[PDB]
């Protein structure tokens, strides 16, 4: 009605190190 | 002169994968 049940908790990242690209001449 | 400056970066890909092969063997 109201509710519907528990949908599955997706746990994001806490330290997550991901290096920036560089530019490329596209 | 003019009508080669209105046009100096007017060259055509022919696709994604060729793109990413001529911008790879330049750095490689």
């Given at each position: 009605?109201?509710?519907?049940?528990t949908?599955?908790?997706?746990?994001?990242?806490?330290?997550?190190?991901?290096?920036?690209?560089?530019?490329?001449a596209? | 002169?003019?009508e080669?400056?209105?046009?100096?970066?007017?060259e055509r890909?022919?696709?994604?994968?060729?793109?990413?092969?001529?911008?790879?063997?330049?750095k490689?």
């Amino acid at each position: 009605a109201i509710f519907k049940q528990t949908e599955p908790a997706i746990p994001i990242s806490e330290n997550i190190s991901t290096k920036t690209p560089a530019p490329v001449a596209y | 002169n003019y009508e080669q400056l209105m046009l100096i970066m007017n060259e055509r890909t022919t696709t994604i994968t060729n793109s990413t092969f001529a911008v790879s063997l330049t750095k490689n």
